[PDB]
Each structure stands twice: as C-alpha cells, then as structure tokens.
C-alpha cells in the first residue's frame, strides 16, 4: 500500500456522502446500491462510519461528469480515465467524480460502477496506488463473485484508521 503525502487523513470517524446526480446508463437504485456497497467495503475493515445527505455539502460529494466539469481536471472521453477522487480534506477534497463517457454497468459488460467506486473511495479516504496487482488500489482493476479486498488494501486503510472497534 501507499499513503498520500503528509498523510491527509480524515480527523473524524463519521463521514457523510451525497450522490449529486445520476447517470443515464443505469437505474437510480443501481447507482445507490453500487455506492453503498463501495462504502461498505471500507467500513467493514475500519472504525469508519457513513451516512447520506440529500442537501448541503457532504464530506464525499459524488457526481457524474464529462469533459470540463468545474475543476481543473477535465475528463477525457470514452475509456482511459474512468473517474477521479480527491484525498481527505475540506471542500473539493474527498470528492469523487465519474466519467459519464464510460458506460456504467452493474456487471462486467461495461465499466463496473461498484468496482470503480470502491477504488475511488479508497482515494477519498487517503490511499494512493498499490504495487500489488491483486489490490483494489492497484491502478489496474479490471468475476465480481470473486471480489475480495486484498490484505494489502486492509493493511493500508488500517494504517490510517486502525481496525474495527470490537
Ligand atoms: Ca474516460
Ligand atoms: Ca469534499
Ligand atoms: Ca455514460
Ligand atoms: Zn473532476
Ligand atoms: Zn486510482
């Protein structure tokens, strides 16, 4: 695992998230489910907890976007960069953006929303890219049935937030 410079870490254990918009690619319930599942991946192995907001600024603002979208890092069309997320902190920090020029799917027929979300949330929590090819934080993620957080990812996230309480 790799942890970001000067260890930007959330100073608190409870984080809020907000799904700002929805992709035409999928039913809204599929987007919500994929996000909830992605958050659970990290919650299960740390003391972190999450709750959802429908207004105001949540810690983790989640949105779909294309090309120029209000930050200095425009998306690049179909393929290549699939999404991006900012390290812990206020405002844009912690936020996650998903490139709608990808075809988001609940399975592996396009770009799997759950898997990419899980990876990006890793960034939102302070993890950087792993060298372990089997890690969720390896740049190169993609049998969803056989998905399992790697010990490397668990080691990395616990180095920041510790193991579950009890
Ligand atoms: Ca792209
Ligand atoms: Ca934020
Ligand atoms: Ca799309
Ligand atoms: Zn962006
Ligand atoms: Zn990444």
Coordinates of N, CA and C and ligand atoms in Angstrom, one line a residue:
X1 N 0.8 -1.2 0.0 CA 0.0 0.0 0.0 C 0.8 1.3 0.0
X2 N 0.2 2.4 -0.4 CA 0.9 3.7 -0.4 C -0.1 4.7 0.3
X3 N 0.4 5.5 1.2 CA -0.4 6.6 1.8 C 0.1 7.9 1.3
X4 N -0.8 8.8 0.9 CA -0.6 10.2 0.4 C 0.4 11.0 1.2
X5 N 1.0 12.1 0.6 CA 2.0 13.0 1.3 C 1.4 13.7 2.5
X6 N 2.2 13.7 3.6 CA 1.8 14.4 4.9 C 0.5 13.8 5.5
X7 N 0.2 12.6 5.0 CA -0.9 11.8 5.4 C -2.3 12.6 5.6
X8 N -2.8 13.1 4.5 CA -4.2 13.7 4.7 C -5.0 12.6 5.1
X9 N -5.7 12.8 6.3 CA -6.5 11.8 6.8 C -7.7 12.5 7.3
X10 N -8.8 11.8 7.3 CA -9.9 12.4 7.9 C -9.6 12.4 9.4
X11 N -9.9 13.5 10.1 CA -9.7 13.6 11.6 C -10.8 13.1 12.3
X12 N -11.9 12.6 11.6 CA -13.0 12.1 12.3 C -13.4 10.7 11.8
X13 N -14.2 10.0 12.5 CA -14.6 8.6 12.1 C -15.9 8.6 11.3
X14 N -16.8 9.5 11.5 CA -18.1 9.5 10.8 C -18.0 10.5 9.6
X15 N -18.2 10.0 8.4 CA -18.2 10.8 7.2 C -19.5 10.8 6.5
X16 N -19.9 11.9 5.8 CA -21.1 11.9 5.1 C -20.8 11.8 3.6
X17 N -21.8 11.3 2.9 CA -21.7 11.3 1.4 C -23.0 11.7 0.8
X18 N -22.9 12.2 -0.4 CA -24.1 12.7 -1.2 C -23.9 12.4 -2.6
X19 N -25.0 11.8 -3.2 CA -25.0 11.5 -4.6 C -25.7 12.6 -5.3
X20 N -24.9 13.5 -5.9 CA -25.3 14.8 -6.5 C -26.1 14.7 -7.8
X21 N -25.8 13.7 -8.7 CA -26.6 13.5 -9.9 C -26.5 12.0 -10.3
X22 N -27.2 11.7 -11.4 CA -27.4 10.3 -11.8 C -27.1 10.1 -13.3
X23 N -26.4 9.0 -13.6 CA -26.1 8.7 -15.0 C -27.3 8.1 -15.7
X24 N -27.4 8.4 -17.0 CA -28.5 7.9 -17.8 C -28.3 6.4 -18.0
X25 N -27.0 5.9 -17.8 CA -26.7 4.5 -18.0 C -27.4 3.4 -17.2
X26 N -27.9 3.8 -16.0 CA -28.4 2.8 -15.0 C -29.6 3.3 -14.2
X27 N -30.4 2.4 -13.8 CA -31.5 2.8 -12.9 C -30.8 3.5 -11.7
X28 N -31.5 4.5 -11.1 CA -31.0 5.2 -10.0 C -30.7 4.3 -8.8
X29 N -31.6 3.3 -8.6 CA -31.3 2.3 -7.5 C -30.0 1.5 -7.6
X30 N -29.5 1.4 -8.9 CA -28.3 0.6 -9.1 C -27.1 1.5 -8.8
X31 N -27.2 2.8 -9.0 CA -26.2 3.7 -8.6 C -26.1 3.8 -7.1
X32 N -27.2 3.9 -6.4 CA -27.2 4.0 -5.0 C -26.6 2.7 -4.4
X33 N -27.0 1.6 -4.9 CA -26.5 0.3 -4.4 C -25.0 0.1 -4.6
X34 N -24.5 0.5 -5.8 CA -23.1 0.4 -6.0 C -22.3 1.3 -5.1
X35 N -22.8 2.5 -4.8 CA -22.2 3.4 -3.9 C -22.2 2.9 -2.5
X36 N -23.3 2.4 -2.0 CA -23.5 1.9 -0.7 C -22.5 0.7 -0.5
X37 N -22.5 -0.1 -1.5 CA -21.6 -1.3 -1.4 C -20.1 -0.9 -1.4
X38 N -19.8 0.0 -2.2 CA -18.4 0.5 -2.2 C -18.0 1.1 -0.8
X39 N -18.9 1.8 -0.2 CA -18.6 2.3 1.2 C -18.4 1.2 2.2
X40 N -19.3 0.2 2.1 CA -19.3 -1.0 3.0 C -17.9 -1.7 2.9
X41 N -17.3 -1.8 1.8 CA -16.0 -2.4 1.6 C -15.0 -1.9 2.6
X42 N -15.0 -0.6 2.7 CA -14.1 0.1 3.7 C -14.5 0.2 5.1
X43 N -15.8 0.3 5.3 CA -16.4 0.4 6.6 C -16.2 -0.9 7.4
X44 N -16.2 -2.1 6.7 CA -16.1 -3.4 7.3 C -14.7 -3.6 7.9
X45 N -13.7 -2.9 7.5 CA -12.4 -3.1 8.0 C -11.7 -2.0 8.7
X46 N -12.5 -1.0 9.2 CA -12.1 0.2 9.9 C -13.1 0.6 10.9
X47 N -12.9 1.6 11.7 CA -13.9 2.2 12.6 C -14.8 3.2 11.8
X48 N -14.5 3.5 10.6 CA -15.2 4.5 9.8 C -16.7 4.2 9.6
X49 N -17.6 5.2 9.8 CA -19.0 5.0 9.5 C -19.4 6.1 8.5
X50 N -20.5 5.8 7.9 CA -21.0 6.7 6.8 C -22.5 7.0 6.9
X51 N -22.9 8.2 6.5 CA -24.3 8.4 6.5 C -24.6 9.4 5.2
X52 N -25.8 9.3 4.7 CA -26.1 10.0 3.5 C -26.9 11.4 3.7
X53 N -26.6 12.3 2.8 CA -27.2 13.7 2.8 C -27.8 13.9 1.5
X54 N -28.8 14.7 1.4 CA -29.5 15.0 0.2 C -29.5 16.5 -0.1
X55 N -28.8 17.2 0.7 CA -28.7 18.7 0.6 C -27.4 19.1 1.4
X56 N -26.9 20.3 1.1 CA -25.7 20.7 1.8 C -24.5 20.0 1.2
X57 N -23.3 20.3 1.9 CA -22.0 19.7 1.5 C -21.7 18.5 2.3
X58 N -21.7 17.3 1.7 CA -21.3 16.1 2.5 C -19.8 16.1 2.3
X59 N -19.2 15.3 3.2 CA -17.7 15.1 3.1 C -17.3 14.7 1.7
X60 N -18.0 13.6 1.2 CA -17.8 13.0 0.0 C -18.9 13.3 -1.0
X61 N -18.7 14.2 -1.9 CA -19.7 14.6 -2.9 C -19.4 13.7 -4.1
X62 N -20.4 13.0 -4.6 CA -20.3 12.1 -5.7 C -21.1 12.5 -6.9
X63 N -20.4 12.6 -8.0 CA -21.1 13.0 -9.2 C -20.6 12.4 -10.5
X64 N -21.5 12.4 -11.5 CA -21.1 12.0 -12.9 C -20.8 13.3 -13.7
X65 N -19.8 13.2 -14.6 CA -19.4 14.3 -15.3 C -18.7 14.0 -16.7
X66 N -18.6 14.9 -17.6 CA -17.9 14.7 -18.8 C -17.1 15.9 -19.2
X67 N -15.9 15.6 -19.7 CA -15.0 16.7 -20.2 C -14.8 17.7 -19.0
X68 N -14.9 19.0 -19.4 CA -14.8 20.1 -18.3 C -16.0 20.0 -17.4
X69 N -15.8 20.0 -16.1 CA -16.9 19.8 -15.2 C -16.8 20.7 -13.9
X70 N -16.0 21.7 -14.0 CA -15.9 22.6 -12.7 C -14.7 22.4 -11.9
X71 N -13.7 21.7 -12.4 CA -12.4 21.5 -11.7 C -11.4 21.6 -12.7
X72 N -10.1 21.6 -12.4 CA -9.0 21.7 -13.3 C -8.6 20.4 -14.0
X73 N -9.4 19.4 -13.8 CA -9.1 18.1 -14.4 C -10.2 17.5 -15.3
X74 N -10.3 18.1 -16.5 CA -11.4 17.6 -17.3 C -11.3 16.1 -17.6
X75 N -12.4 15.5 -17.8 CA -12.4 14.1 -18.2 C -12.0 14.0 -19.7
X76 N -11.7 12.8 -20.2 CA -11.1 12.5 -21.5 C -11.9 11.7 -22.5
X77 N -13.2 11.7 -22.4 CA -14.0 10.9 -23.4 C -14.0 9.5 -23.0
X78 N -14.4 8.6 -23.9 CA -14.5 7.2 -23.7 C -13.2 6.5 -23.4
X79 N -13.2 5.6 -22.4 CA -12.1 4.9 -21.9 C -11.0 5.7 -21.2
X80 N -9.9 5.1 -20.9 CA -8.8 5.7 -20.2 C -9.1 6.1 -18.8
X81 N -9.2 7.4 -18.5 CA -9.5 7.8 -17.2 C -11.0 7.5 -17.0
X82 N -11.4 6.7 -16.0 CA -12.8 6.3 -15.8 C -13.4 7.2 -14.7
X83 N -12.7 7.8 -13.8 CA -13.2 8.5 -12.6 C -11.9 9.1 -11.9
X84 N -12.2 10.0 -11.0 CA -11.1 10.5 -10.2 C -11.6 11.0 -8.8
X85 N -10.8 11.1 -7.8 CA -11.2 11.4 -6.5 C -10.1 12.1 -5.7
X86 N -10.5 13.1 -4.9 CA -9.5 13.9 -4.1 C -9.3 13.3 -2.7
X87 N -8.1 13.4 -2.2 CA -7.7 13.0 -0.9 C -8.5 13.7 0.2
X88 N -8.4 13.2 1.4 CA -9.2 13.8 2.5 C -9.0 15.3 2.7
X89 N -10.0 16.0 3.1 CA -9.9 17.4 3.4 C -11.2 18.1 3.2
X90 N -11.3 19.4 3.3 CA -12.5 20.2 3.1 C -12.7 20.5 1.7
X91 N -14.0 21.0 1.4 CA -14.4 21.4 0.1 C -14.3 20.3 -1.0
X92 N -13.6 20.5 -2.1 CA -13.5 19.5 -3.1 C -12.7 18.3 -2.6
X93 N -11.9 18.4 -1.6 CA -11.2 17.3 -1.1 C -12.2 16.2 -0.6
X94 N -11.8 14.9 -0.8 CA -12.7 13.8 -0.6 C -13.8 13.5 -1.7
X95 N -14.0 14.5 -2.6 CA -15.0 14.3 -3.6 C -14.6 13.3 -4.7
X96 N -15.6 12.6 -5.3 CA -15.4 11.6 -6.3 C -16.2 12.0 -7.6
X97 N -15.6 12.0 -8.7 CA -16.2 12.3 -10.0 C -16.1 11.0 -10.9
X98 N -17.1 10.7 -11.6 CA -17.2 9.6 -12.5 C -17.4 10.0 -14.0
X99 N -16.6 9.6 -14.9 CA -16.7 10.0 -16.3 C -17.9 9.3 -17.0
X100 N -18.9 10.1 -17.3 CA -20.1 9.6 -18.0 C -19.9 9.2 -19.5
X101 N -18.7 9.4 -20.0 CA -18.4 8.9 -21.3 C -18.1 7.4 -21.2
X102 N -18.1 6.9 -20.0 CA -18.0 5.4 -19.8 C -19.4 4.9 -19.8
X103 N -19.7 3.7 -20.1 CA -21.0 3.0 -19.9 C -20.9 2.3 -18.6
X104 N -21.5 2.9 -17.5 CA -21.6 2.3 -16.2 C -22.5 1.1 -16.1
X105 N -22.0 0.0 -15.7 CA -22.8 -1.2 -15.5 C -22.9 -1.9 -14.2
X106 N -23.9 -2.7 -13.9 CA -23.9 -3.4 -12.6 C -23.1 -4.7 -12.7
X107 N -22.8 -5.1 -13.9 CA -21.9 -6.3 -14.2 C -20.7 -5.9 -14.9
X108 N -20.0 -6.8 -15.6 CA -18.8 -6.5 -16.3 C -18.9 -6.2 -17.8
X109 N -20.1 -5.9 -18.3 CA -20.3 -5.7 -19.7 C -19.9 -4.3 -20.2
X110 N -19.8 -3.4 -19.2 CA -19.2 -2.1 -19.5 C -18.2 -1.8 -18.4
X111 N -18.1 -0.6 -17.8 CA -17.3 -0.3 -16.7 C -18.1 -0.5 -15.4
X112 N -17.7 -1.4 -14.6 CA -18.4 -1.7 -13.3 C -18.4 -0.6 -12.3
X113 N -19.5 0.0 -12.1 CA -19.7 1.1 -11.1 C -19.2 0.8 -9.7
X114 N -19.6 -0.4 -9.2 CA -19.2 -0.8 -7.8 C -17.7 -0.8 -7.7
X115 N -17.0 -1.4 -8.7 CA -15.6 -1.6 -8.5 C -14.8 -0.3 -8.6
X116 N -15.2 0.6 -9.5 CA -14.6 1.8 -9.7 C -14.8 2.7 -8.5
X117 N -16.1 2.7 -8.0 CA -16.5 3.5 -6.8 C -15.6 3.0 -5.6
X118 N -15.5 1.7 -5.5 CA -14.7 1.2 -4.3 C -13.3 1.7 -4.4
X119 N -12.7 1.7 -5.6 CA -11.4 2.2 -5.8 C -11.3 3.7 -5.5
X120 N -12.2 4.5 -6.1 CA -12.1 5.9 -5.9 C -12.3 6.3 -4.4
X121 N -13.2 5.6 -3.7 CA -13.4 5.9 -2.3 C -12.2 5.6 -1.5
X122 N -11.4 4.6 -2.0 CA -10.1 4.4 -1.4 C -9.3 5.7 -1.4
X123 N -9.3 6.4 -2.6 CA -8.6 7.6 -2.7 C -9.2 8.7 -1.8
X124 N -10.5 8.8 -1.7 CA -11.2 9.7 -0.9 C -10.8 9.5 0.6
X125 N -10.4 8.3 0.9 CA -10.0 8.1 2.3 C -8.5 8.2 2.6
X126 N -7.8 8.5 1.6 CA -6.3 8.7 1.7 C -5.4 7.7 1.2
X127 N -5.9 6.6 0.5 CA -5.0 5.7 -0.1 C -4.6 6.1 -1.5
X128 N -3.4 5.7 -1.9 CA -2.8 6.0 -3.2 C -2.6 4.7 -3.9
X129 N -2.0 4.7 -5.1 CA -1.8 3.4 -5.8 C -0.9 2.4 -5.2
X130 N -1.4 1.1 -5.1 CA -0.6 0.0 -4.7 C 0.2 -0.7 -5.8
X131 N 1.3 -1.4 -5.4 CA 2.1 -2.1 -6.4 C 1.6 -3.5 -6.5
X132 N 0.8 -3.9 -5.6 CA 0.3 -5.3 -5.6 C -0.8 -5.4 -6.6
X133 N -0.6 -6.3 -7.7 CA -1.5 -6.4 -8.7 C -2.9 -7.0 -8.3
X134 N -3.0 -7.5 -7.2 CA -4.3 -8.1 -6.8 C -5.0 -7.1 -5.9
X135 N -4.5 -5.9 -5.6 CA -5.1 -5.0 -4.7 C -6.2 -4.1 -5.4
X136 N -7.2 -3.8 -4.6 CA -8.2 -2.8 -5.2 C -7.6 -1.5 -5.6
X137 N -6.5 -1.1 -4.8 CA -5.9 0.2 -5.1 C -4.8 0.1 -6.2
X138 N -4.6 -1.1 -6.8 CA -3.7 -1.2 -8.0 C -4.3 -0.4 -9.1
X139 N -3.6 0.4 -9.9 CA -4.2 1.2 -10.9 C -5.1 0.4 -11.8
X140 N -4.8 -0.9 -11.9 CA -5.4 -1.7 -13.0 C -6.4 -2.7 -12.6
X141 N -7.5 -2.3 -11.9 CA -8.6 -3.2 -11.6 C -9.4 -3.4 -12.8
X142 N -9.4 -4.6 -13.3 CA -10.2 -5.0 -14.5 C -9.6 -4.4 -15.7
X143 N -15.3 -11.7 -12.7 CA -15.8 -12.5 -11.6 C -16.0 -11.6 -10.4
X144 N -17.0 -10.8 -10.4 CA -17.4 -9.9 -9.3 C -17.7 -10.9 -8.2
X145 N -18.1 -12.1 -8.5 CA -18.4 -13.1 -7.5 C -17.2 -13.3 -6.7
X146 N -16.0 -13.2 -7.3 CA -14.8 -13.5 -6.6 C -14.1 -12.2 -6.1
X147 N -14.8 -11.1 -6.0 CA -14.2 -9.9 -5.5 C -13.9 -10.0 -4.0
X148 N -12.7 -9.6 -3.5 CA -12.3 -9.6 -2.1 C -11.3 -8.6 -1.9
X149 N -11.5 -7.7 -0.9 CA -10.5 -6.7 -0.6 C -9.2 -7.4 -0.3
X150 N -8.1 -7.0 -0.8 CA -6.8 -7.7 -0.6 C -6.2 -7.3 0.8
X151 N -5.3 -8.2 1.4 CA -4.7 -7.8 2.6 C -3.9 -6.5 2.5
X152 N -3.4 -6.3 1.3 CA -2.7 -5.0 1.1 C -3.6 -3.8 1.3
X153 N -4.8 -3.8 0.8 CA -5.7 -2.7 1.0 C -6.1 -2.6 2.4
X154 N -6.3 -3.7 3.1 CA -6.7 -3.7 4.5 C -5.5 -3.1 5.3
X155 N -4.3 -3.5 5.0 CA -3.1 -3.0 5.7 C -3.1 -1.5 5.6
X156 N -3.2 -1.0 4.3 CA -3.1 0.4 4.0 C -4.3 1.2 4.8
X157 N -5.5 0.8 4.6 CA -6.5 1.6 5.3 C -6.4 1.5 6.8
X158 N -6.0 0.4 7.4 CA -5.8 0.3 8.8 C -4.7 1.1 9.3
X159 N -3.7 1.3 8.5 CA -2.5 2.1 8.9 C -2.9 3.5 9.1
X160 N -4.1 3.9 8.5 CA -4.6 5.2 8.7 C -5.6 5.3 9.8
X161 N -6.6 4.4 9.8 CA -7.7 4.5 10.7 C -7.8 3.4 11.7
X162 N -6.9 2.4 11.7 CA -7.0 1.3 12.6 C -8.0 0.2 12.3
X163 N -8.1 -0.9 13.0 CA -9.0 -2.0 12.8 C -10.4 -1.7 13.3
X164 N -11.4 -2.4 13.0 CA -12.7 -2.2 13.6 C -12.7 -2.3 15.2
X165 N -13.5 -1.5 15.8 CA -13.6 -1.3 17.3 C -13.7 -2.6 18.1
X166 N -14.7 -3.4 17.9 CA -14.9 -4.6 18.6 C -15.6 -5.7 17.8
Ligands
LIG1 CA1 -12.8 8.5 -19.9
LIG2 CA1 -15.5 17.2 -0.1
LIG3 CA1 -22.5 7.1 -19.8
LIG4 ZN1 -13.4 16.2 -11.5
LIG5 ZN1 -6.7 5.1 -8.7

